[PDB]
Design a binder for this molecule. Sequence first.
Ligand code: AKG
Ligand code: CL
Ligand code: NI
Length: 366
Amino acid sequence: PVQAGTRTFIKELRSRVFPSADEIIIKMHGSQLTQRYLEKHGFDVPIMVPKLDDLGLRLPSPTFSVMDVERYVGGDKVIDVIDVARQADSKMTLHNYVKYFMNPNRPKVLNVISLEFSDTKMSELVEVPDIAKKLSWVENYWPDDSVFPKPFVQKYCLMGVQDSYTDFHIDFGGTSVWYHVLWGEKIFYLIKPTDENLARYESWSSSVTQSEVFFGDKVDKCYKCVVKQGHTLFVPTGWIHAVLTSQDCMAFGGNFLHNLNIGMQLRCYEMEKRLKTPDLFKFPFFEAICWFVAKNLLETLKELREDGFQPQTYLVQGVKALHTALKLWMKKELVSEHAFEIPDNVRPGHLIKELSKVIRAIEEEN
Ligand SMILES: O=C(O)CCC(=O)C(=O)O
Ligand SMILES: [Cl-]
Ligand code: NI
């Protein structure tokens, strides 16, 4: 049995020719990637931005080394590290990983994909794509006065050696991402969130054979997307993807929720609940933000109805979806474990009704 992350498994991965991600991804320039665009055409396929022009993406020169990270962040920090051959989580000092990295003669393949650096000297050196900041629920709807700490998941630094591999997952909470390769090369394997595929993914995720079964074989199309130095990949809600670090690589990235695919975001959250994913501890107060969002989304639909206007499709879909999930989390039987995410401001039962009544009309009123 070929085990994931092992050199044998890597020979096969490097051998398969996959349908090109050119079949589905949209290439565009910095300046085309706007809220306006995405509201009209949707954000349902990865968007590749070959040049970083007009993204608002500010980051270190292409020479920024693993050693420079160690400085700005602090070698003392204890970071998560993947033993790729074992597909398990390890810990070590940033200082050591840099030693391990800096030396050829790597006795094993070790990846760093989760090193969030907002609260460090290094943060000053990085500004995320304007588009991620424009869409992000944290940027738009997180009150300056809640008890829940603000999630910091916008600035990640990724260092990985050749043959680092991450297996097929859906990002925590169903968040979208951007990734930028500073040097080296990453290769994403991408799988559309059809229902066939999601379901198959939940199955595979809770099969004990998971690490012996390449989930790419289980779906009709698994798209290969090679992200080279200086390019910028944007992956939308729910997309199932694996990643291969084909060359020693440093990348930057960030995660964010937004209003476009609220339904898929919820589906993904409720699925990660079912699977008990530790990933979900990176966005602990997903539910809280959802409440804050339903407030704002309600207000917008109230303004459109009070003036005879018709709301865009994605807003009706999303609101209906929020409504279903707030209602679920409030059921008397489930309510004991959701109640703590209920922000002090919002009024659970009231809000849910105001949503119910708004969603009637729109339906019938259309
Ligand atoms: O580059 C990697 O190995 C994985 C990137 C990614 O998909 C993640 O960390 O969530
Ligand atoms: Cl967000
Ligand atoms: Ni990912």
